[model samples]
Target: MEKQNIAVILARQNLPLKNLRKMNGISLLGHTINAAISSKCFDRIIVSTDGGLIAEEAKNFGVEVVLRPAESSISGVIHALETIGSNSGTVTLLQPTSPLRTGAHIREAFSLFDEKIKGSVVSACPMEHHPLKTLLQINNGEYAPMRHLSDLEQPRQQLPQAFRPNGAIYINDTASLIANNCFFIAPTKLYIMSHQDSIDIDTELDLQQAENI
Candidate 1:
């Protein structure tokens, strides 16, 4: 809670050559790394990545590096959380795609963790639409609510409260991370964030927008 060892994981893959090269400028990896370094909040800051170029880029900024194995850099090897090595206390997992995240958001999330009730915490934004009223299919293909006793179709505001994982930050207790064998929160707390700060890049359109900036 007091001093946390933060690790920001940047998964490497064969992104469009232009896209890959433009990530820092567009995706905000550079901005995120700079913010982290300036914070002085983290006891240790590391960027876990597999791409040689990405490693080189991060290195230029003087950020500590965690080199991911080439084999684990592929699509199915996305469970980067397991690869993180932590002795104890807290680990704040960061992603380069969510460039808008700031040091202030990180501080707030780490401060809110209560070991008594929460095993982990991750950044999230209010759902674009109500998720509880989501639709699903029965065995016969009849539509039903995803959650029990909820309507299949309703106005967005009428639906119950819901949150969407924004991929901005994931702060986890080491014990819980090991126990769950996952990077996700269990009996977790959701640190809600603003929509602007939660932007995650995964598509060409997303890359283009980031690039324009």
Candidate 2:
């Protein structure tokens, strides 16, 4: 199949952010769109949204817009892909919440997306604390070990390097994504990003922190 790189920005309405969260003086959606444009990696930059306002904003930026159906029950990513029609082989998912993720990051991730070596590449950052040192709330609300740790007091540096998806960048094969309905399929690679660049704004506090950064 011919390689066709497409970058899809997921921007939905009725959430805390409705395509107009300000980050560094620019709306989050605008920042994301500018980053995608600067990457110079995609054949097309498409915005998938359920909000008319978002579509208008996307048009102002000169990117294609895919309006999602109001009653559609499909996943947002899947719906966006479906609306895009065929003729695409690779897709890069860029979430607007990650304001610090710039075009450089996307370009680097795309470079690492070697079809011969990996089927997908997802951005991730080193965990603040090892998962083995984490706790979970049980039925009674008591703290319990998230993982069985043989050495509870092991030095932080002694623990294996652990990373978590940062929700910033996801590069996947179109066919594999359609079959798996997810991006974390086998033959996947992680693009390690800096902690500051991996801040995924989900709460007001997170938004503040991103602003401060």
Candidate 3:
């Protein structure tokens, strides 16, 4: 393996949901930075923001801050790479919403990303409701089964395991990211995380639940 520098990218924009919201004592962004730092996983921890109180807070952590254009509609991870002029090596995306994900989790994930694994690594948790047990609202406002199962009454354990991306950790090469323009590429691997660690705060209810954990 080459000397790959881990670029931990944290991107934030002015959303209805709070990225600076305090969970425990530290803000979500603050907590994320702290975890990345503690992991000793990155050569650079960059914050891509539109410039506001969020940027100011990010600077306090002493990491590089890339001033993102307000109108750039590109994906945050892509924007960060473009801004940093990244051409190679791995980049780990750490979203501020997933505060429960710690440094240990990050280290463990990296350990799995060896020379044999060419694709990306994503953090995910078991789905609360299996797709077979889900329903969709049709045009007539009638509920329809999401999955076409011959035996709809199969026990939960009998169903195949399913997982949902937790938006916690995403590790991929810069070249691959530029080629795909997305994270979930083929030959991808999953880092199975606990449900509690997968809580991504997008609403007030989510924040409350995260804090309560």
Candidate 4:
């Protein structure tokens, strides 16, 4: 498949934000646009948004806008794709809340797509805590292990590493996305991103932490 390299930066108000929230003196959406543009990876940079202000904000960044008329529990990537008539090529899904994710990360992820691409490429980071060290307990009264406790007693240094998709970047083809209804398909490739760059600002606490960073 010829990679058209279309990027859709989602600015929908899925979380607490629907418009500009400044970070580093730039709107959160602005930050996302900066990274997307700076990446120099996408042939077309489209901002998928329902908010009028968001659309305007996108234009201010000199990128195209794809208006989503309604809402969905699913991502707006599909709608953006259909609206743009993007029948082919790859789609890189980015979110405005990941303000810390830089152009370097996006560019690197794009570069990785060429050496051999498959299912999808998503930004992920090492789990803060070992999965084996997790628990499912309301207290000692009713307790269960989240995973096998076989490695619980082993030293932390020996614990197997686990990675999690950080809601920062996602790359997948149009066909797989239109067919599967989700961009995340296996066997998925992980684009390892730093912990700070992975900060997803959904809640106020997250925003504050992002500020400190």
Summed backbone clashes in each candidate are 0, 0, 0, 0
Looking at candidate 3, the ten consecutive residues that score lowest on lDDT are 1-10
TM-score of each: 0.78, 0.87, 0.86, 0.86
Q: lDDT tens digits, residues 86-183, model 4?
A: 86888888888799988989988877664345578889999877778777887869866676677667766887778999988988876777788887
lDDT, candidate 3, 1-213, per-residue tens: 343555555656563527788888888888888878887888878877775777888889888788777552227777777777775788888888898888899888877664445588889999877878777788777878767654367776898888888989988876777787878766888898999989888888888898898
lDDT of 1 by residue, 68-160 (tens): 665522121123334444445666677767766777887787777776665678889997667776667776768777775546556667766
Clashing pairs in 1: none
Which candidate leads the pack in TM-score? 2
Model 4: per-residue Cα lDDT at residue 71? 62
Candidate 2 lands at a TM-score of 0.87
RMSD of 3: 2.8
What residue pairs are clashing in model 4? none
Per residue, candidate 2 scores C-alpha lDDT tens digits across 73-110 of 12666777777774357888898889889999999999
Question: Which sequence of candidate numbers ranks them by lDDT, best first?
Answer: 2, 4, 3, 1
